[PDB]
Amino acid sequence: GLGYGSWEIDPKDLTFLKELGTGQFGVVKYGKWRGQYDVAIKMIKEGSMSEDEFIEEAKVMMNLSHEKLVQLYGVCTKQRPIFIITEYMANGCLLNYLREMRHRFQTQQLLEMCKDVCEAMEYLESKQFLHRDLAARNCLVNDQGVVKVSDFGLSRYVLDDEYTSSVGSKFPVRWSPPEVLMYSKFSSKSDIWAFGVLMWEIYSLGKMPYERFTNSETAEHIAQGLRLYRPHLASEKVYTIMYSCWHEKADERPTFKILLSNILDVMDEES
């Protein structure tokens, strides 16, 4: 309507129904858009986001459409707090989902979660778009058990120093390759490394990577060429795929297109 761009949702079209929790930008609620369509609504806490830079990027992010990406539907900018409207995922974050032992997951289900994530990441890679914080905590699960990648690229707009500094308390040390920890060298290959750690989280049913180490000790371990080792539920072929993501040389790490082909081959082998 009048006074609203293509990236703009009228907050009057929202019905707030339940609190979902709190993320880096504050409270997130479940609601309906125009009384019918399920949405998740991020209420952006004041001082948490580089809002003007995000709004300029929101336009591009809304065009990132893939069935395995948690869709950005629009933004509510003509206010304070600003809202980010996204697809709603009924089963919540993947990390908590993995930790629920009631699911009694089969390894074929765990491989399907890896494939869902890999398809989303191949799509982002095809658009030269980095996630920047790929991990099980940044994946969500829908009512059909499909895993989708969430909040891709939003790390760029976080104003929190503890999250942005590589030695910060909230920085994703355990999902970072040596070149990020040593030189701040971010690339498609740092998303590849993080994907390998995510496959390890899936096959480990949500254990924390390097669980007996601090972040400082993890950075040292990785720098010395040491790695996570095989989760009990991962076959040798699955372990070979996640391990390939951790090559010390970033240029020797696979692309998401190659990882997708490896995962499909293993699904065919372990059918």
Ligand X SMILES: Cc1c(NC(=O)c2ccc(C(C)(C)C)cc2)cccc1-c1ccnc2nc(-c3ccc(C(=O)N4CCOCC4)cc3)[nH]c12
Q: Which two tokens stand for residue 176?
A: 């970072």
Q: Which two tokens stand for residue 19?
A: 């609190």
Residue whose CB is less far from ligand X, 170 or 185: 170
By the rule CB under 6 A, 5 interacts with ligand X: no
By the rule CB under 6 A, 51 interacts with ligand X: no
By the rule CB under 6 A, 133 interacts with ligand X: yes
Residue whose CB is less far from ligand X, 96 or 261: 96
Asked if residues 178 and 75 have their Cβ atoms less than 8 Å apart, the reply is no
By the rule CB under 6 A, 72 interacts with ligand X: no
Residue whose CB is less far from ligand X, 20 or 114: 20
Exactly one of 136, 154, 205, 266 binds ligand X (CB under 6 A); that residue is 154
Exactly one of 71, 77, 155, 204 binds ligand X (CB under 6 A); that residue is 155
Q: Rounded to an integer, what distance in angstroms lies between the CA atom of residue 144 and that of residue 163?
A: 32
Exactly one of 7, 9, 14, 20 binds ligand X (CB under 6 A); that residue is 20
By the rule CB under 6 A, 150 interacts with ligand X: yes
**Is the link from the previous residue into 254 a cis peptide, with omega within 30 of 0?**
no
Exactly one of 89, 113, 242, 260 binds ligand X (CB under 6 A); that residue is 89
Residue 127 C-beta: closest distance to ligand X, Å: 18
By the rule CB under 6 A, 23 interacts with ligand X: yes
Does residue 151 have an active-site annotation? no
Q: Rounded to an integer, what distance in angstroms lies between the CA atom of residue 91 and that of residue 178?
A: 33
Catalytic residue among 13, 52, 116, 133: 133
By the rule CB under 6 A, 24 interacts with ligand X: yes
Where in the chain does DSSP place strands (E)? 14-23, 26-33, 37-43, 72-76, 83-86, 92-93, 139-141, 147-149
Spatial CB neighbours of 128, under 8 Å, sequence gap ≥ 6: 188
**Is the link from the previous residue into 11 a cis peptide, with omega within 30 of 0?**
no
Q: Rounded to an integer, what distance in angstroms lies between the CA atom of residue 79 and that of residue 62?
A: 20
Angle between helices 188-203 and 236-244 (to 10 degrees): 150
Stretch that binds ligand X, among 149-157, 194-202, 207-215, 219-227 (CB under 6 A): 149-157
By CB under 6 A, name the binding residues for ligand X. 20-21, 23-25, 28, 40, 42, 86, 88-92, 133, 138, 140, 150-151, 154-155, 158
